Enzyme design. Structure first.
Site, mmCIF file in Angstrom:
data_model
loop_
_atom_site.group_PDB
_atom_site.id
_atom_site.type_symbol
_atom_site.label_atom_id
_atom_site.label_comp_id
_atom_site.label_asym_id
_atom_site.label_seq_id
_atom_site.Cartn_x
_atom_site.Cartn_y
_atom_site.Cartn_z
ATOM 1 N N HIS A 214 39.459 50.028 41.160
ATOM 2 C CA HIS A 214 40.846 50.405 41.284
ATOM 3 C C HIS A 214 41.660 50.118 40.037
ATOM 4 C CE1 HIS A 214 41.486 46.200 42.838
ATOM 5 N NE2 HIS A 214 42.655 46.360 42.241
ATOM 6 N N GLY B 178 47.217 40.583 40.194
ATOM 7 C CA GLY B 178 46.530 40.493 38.929
ATOM 8 C C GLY B 178 45.247 39.658 38.934
ATOM 9 N N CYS C 149 42.467 40.425 40.644
ATOM 10 C CA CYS C 149 41.263 41.207 40.878
ATOM 11 C C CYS C 149 40.336 41.153 39.674
ATOM 12 C CB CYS C 149 41.646 42.638 41.244
ATOM 13 S SG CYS C 149 42.235 42.611 42.921
#
Lengths: 303, 303
Positions: free
Chosen positions: B43, B145, B147
């Site tokens: 993503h 933030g 991930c």
């Protein structure tokens, strides 16, 4: 519902690069290598059958530089000077640690959190975070050979070394030295039963936890009733709580949540008598292992 | 009395040296750099107003190598190939990470513990340890933030990467991918409300905790009564416990303590109905966050 709070440690890599093995006779433990200095517990000098009531001043005089073997595991580091400062040794070595981080020495206060790098034979083996208890112990996880393991906080790139591990107490808790060589609390680095001060709930950290609960939608314990700091602190002295001292970090939680400190001081007084079958963030007892800073950082992302 | 049990993480230094920042358009998250490959959540390709129900196959086709910016913070790493594997991207870069540790990829099972390196903007910021829950979430601590933050276990010098962080669920828990690109559980990497399986007590870890209590002199819950594994597992299915599967690590605790598993299975059945005002290792509820391995290592020093 999960609070989003975990026991969080600093990344340990900067400190791993500072860990060494120190051996003196038949004793082996960990040391911390910064610049041209290796710090380690002075009981590395002590023979086993002297660990209870050692005479460290005599031991120190009996040692030469060649008495000490310092090894890095990821090198032998030649010792060129030795000194004793309180309960620590300061060994001077001929090579400066090229991985020395920016660092300071500091003393950590009751209720404050720090990270520990647990090491054996100079080899980092785990990391965890503890709060300094009001009786100057920590509830750590340390075995034979872990002495010289270090605790630290971090501000920016700067590592603030605050703890070098020395001993396990009869109730299973642990204590050690600051890097000025003083032991935390009234403890001595001798293998004899010592009195332990009684522990207390860290009131500022319970407040922080109650704010974390509110930040997660859990607020059934919040009433309009209020207890003054002054009034709470008198109560605290009679109920095995620390006296409460607010900080800018606690104030930020009050602002974000719209709940006054004094409301949570009242709540603690009531919750102490009992939770009456309810839970707070999954717990049926007060939690004092999370600081206002932890809550601000982990839940709100605030510095 | 303190059990000597803490939430212990692996030292994080080996993994810190593998963390990078990945940016694609107006999306920025963390990646893992091993050899000539950078792994990151797919993503990163997605624009914000598409995070719910993105079409990743189309997104992937729309990207070139120059769509991806990889930066190390402690270097720009030029991307020379890109592929999608399940919910991860595999970016090929022109420079092999000279700090690549010995590593494998593995899949972690419910009840098993692993260490997480929480990172933001490619910068390691904390570490903690979690157990994979029976519903394939973890009770972590992750913000916007985070991930691409990674989870791992360690055997010897070998790092076994098992988790890359993807999402936060409505109940505040977290989930992510294995490095074959599958999500843990039945979750999808789309920003839509998803059903969450119900969680369960991890019975093997409750047993481990009860053994830790015995190892600390706390055994009031041990009776001669016994429940078979088979009988307990039928009960477990009706009471939101995992079915119990013994291991060599549990057997070692039984041998050291002289208490049979089946005695503790009986105890759990009774303690589930209530502790009747007593505590176990400071707790009034069953604890399933410590594994048999944790107890063997932290209390007994056993591998």
């Amino acid at each position: 519902h999960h609070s989003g709070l975990v026991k969080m440690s600093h990344p340990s890599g900067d400190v791993e690069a500072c860990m060494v093995q120190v051996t003196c006779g038949s004793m082996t433990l960990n040391g911390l290598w910064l610049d041209n200095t290796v710090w380690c517990p002075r009981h590395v000098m002590c023979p086993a059958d002297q660990l209870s009531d050692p005479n460290y001043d005599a031991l120190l005089i009996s040692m030469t530089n060649h008495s000490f073997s310092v090894q890095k595991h990821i090198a032998n580091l030649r010792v060129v000077g030795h000194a004793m400062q309180g309960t620590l040794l300061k060994l001077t070595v001929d090579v400066a640690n090229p991985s020395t981080p920016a660092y300071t020495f500091t003393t950590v206060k009751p209720g404050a959190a720090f990270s520990v790098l647990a090491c054996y034979n100079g080899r980092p083996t785990g990391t965890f975070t503890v709060v300094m208890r009001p009786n100057y112990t920590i509830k750590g996880s340390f075995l034979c050979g872990s002495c010289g393991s270090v605790g630290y906080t971090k501000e920016g790139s700067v590592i603030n070394f605050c703890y070098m591990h020395q001993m396990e107490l009869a109730n299973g808790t642990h204590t050690g030295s600051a890097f000025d060589g003083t032991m935390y609390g009234a403890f001595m680095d001798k293998q004899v039963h010592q009195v332990q001060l009684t522990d207390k709930y860290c009131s500022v950290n319970v407040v922080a936890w109650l704010y974390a609960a509110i930040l997660n939608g859990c607020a059934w314990f919040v009433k309009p009733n209020r207890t003054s700091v002054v009034s709470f602190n008198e109560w605290a002295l009679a109920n095995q709580f620390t006296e409460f001292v607010g900080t800018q970090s606690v104030d930020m939680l009050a602002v974000k949540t719209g709940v006054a400190i004094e409301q949570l001081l009242y709540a603690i007084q009531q919750l102490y008598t009992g939770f009456q079958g309810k839970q707070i963030l999954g717990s049926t007892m007060l939690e004092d292992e999370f600081t206002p800073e932890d809550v601000n950082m982990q839940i709100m992302g605030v510095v």
